[model samples]
Target: ASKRALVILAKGAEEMETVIPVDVMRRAGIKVTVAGLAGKDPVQCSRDVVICPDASLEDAKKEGPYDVVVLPGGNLGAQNLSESAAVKEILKEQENRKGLIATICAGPTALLAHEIGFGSKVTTHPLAKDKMMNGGHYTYSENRVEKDGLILTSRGPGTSFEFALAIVEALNGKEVAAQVKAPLVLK
Candidate 1:
């Protein structure tokens, strides 16, 4: 069966992080839905790229119970994510179901905000380390990609591909991840 992924798109989200995961997950044959956090509209990204979401988050939840929930980070974006009751509930539900929750850059901080994966070894962009380690609730990692239990995380824009590939491997498999990575032409 094809894996399903939900990517929450918020204003100020890092476009690279958002797009890379969606693109790579699609390449791995995962059914991905990029949902707008505010509403069914175009989101203005951190770098000013505009992304039209597949659906509003409210609408997307109706079709959810997804295999994975992906969070892409920008400080503002992560703050928005961490502040949303909807996001909190979705993260909680995914946790209760034992589904995968993946985040990149500062995105992992949302897991902390939502109280999602308190004890997992997680990584975030170097700048976000302080935020992730605020209470010593969890261990930190410098690995480009860290997957402890169902929480998968990685560092910055340079590591987005690795992060996406990691998610592909987690939901799909190493073979599928390799196949999906081949045509990307990463240096």
Candidate 2:
């Protein structure tokens, strides 16, 4: 079966950070599902960009066995997702199942609060480093992406492409990811 990815979306999500990966993965023929945690319909992202979700978190829980779960960043978005019982349950289940869990920018804070950072190397938005280091060892990287086992993370908005490519490599393979990257003129 093709790899499936679940992207959690909440109010105040960074527009590009959330959509970029979804677009890139779909371009690679991966099944990308945008899941709304707070509503059954469309939700507004950062900068007032409205995006419709393919499914609600409540509904998505029934269609699991996904290859990856991605969390996008924004202060309010991360906070809302972190506090969501359904999101937390999905995260915990992913951990138990050894599925991939990735976050970007302030998104890592949510993961950290859920104890997903235990013994894992992670990075986040510059402002979140102190909080990201709460219960884990974090490496400082100017690079776009960082992968530690099944966990992948990225810096801030600057690394969006690299972040998307990183998840592509993880879900597909280095060769397939390279193909996707080459066409984008990404070095």
Candidate 3:
């Protein structure tokens, strides 16, 4: 059976951060659901790229129990996610089930907002460190992709692919991750 991933898309999300992970997960044969926090309609990204979501966040929640929940980055997007009650419920449920929660750049801030991965070693965009710190609830790391327990985090758009592959390696394995890696010639 394939692993599943849920990516919540917010307005002003970083297109690269959202798309790279989604594409890589598909390559690894993970079933991915791109859920729009706004609605099922197309979302305007930070860079003005518009993405039509696979479903609304509420609709996606009904599917339930994904192997991983992915959070993409953009300052404003992260803010929206952090402010969402629906996102809090999803994170809580995923954490209770011990499922993976992957985030990148400012995305980790949402985890902080929901109090999702306290005490884990997390990372985010350099500019976002203070926001993610949230009065030092969690230890921080500088790794491009940092996976501490079920909470996985990455830096910025430049590290999105690495973040995605880390999720693949966690759910699949090194062999499958490598197989998925070769075609992209990712370093």
Candidate 1 yields a Cα-based lDDT of: 0.95
Q: What is the C-alpha RMSD, rounded to one decimal, of candidate 3?
A: 0.7
* Selected candidate, larger TM-score, 2 vs 3: 3
CA lDDT scores, all candidates in order: 0.95, 0.85, 0.94
Model 2 spans > 4 angstroms off: 135-142
- If scored against the real structure, what TM-score would every candidate get? 0.98, 0.94, 0.98
Cα error, residue 75 of model 3, in Å, equals 0.4
Cand. 2 TM to true fold: 0.94
Off by over 4 Å in 1: none
Q: Is candidate 1 or candidate 2 better by lDDT?
A: 1
Task: Assess the local accuracy of residue 147 in candidate 1 as a C-alpha lDDT between 0 and 100.
Answer: 92
In angstroms, how far off is 72's CA in candidate 2?
0.5
Residue-wise C-alpha lDDT for candidate 1, range 34-60, written one tens digit per residue: 999999999999999999999999999
Model 1 residue 32 CA deviation in Å: 0.4
Error of 1 at 110 (Å): 0.6
Indicate whether candidate 1 or candidate 3 has the larger lDDT: 1
Candidate 3 clash figure, as a count? 0
Residue range 26-53, candidate 3, lDDT tens digits: 9999999999998799999999999999
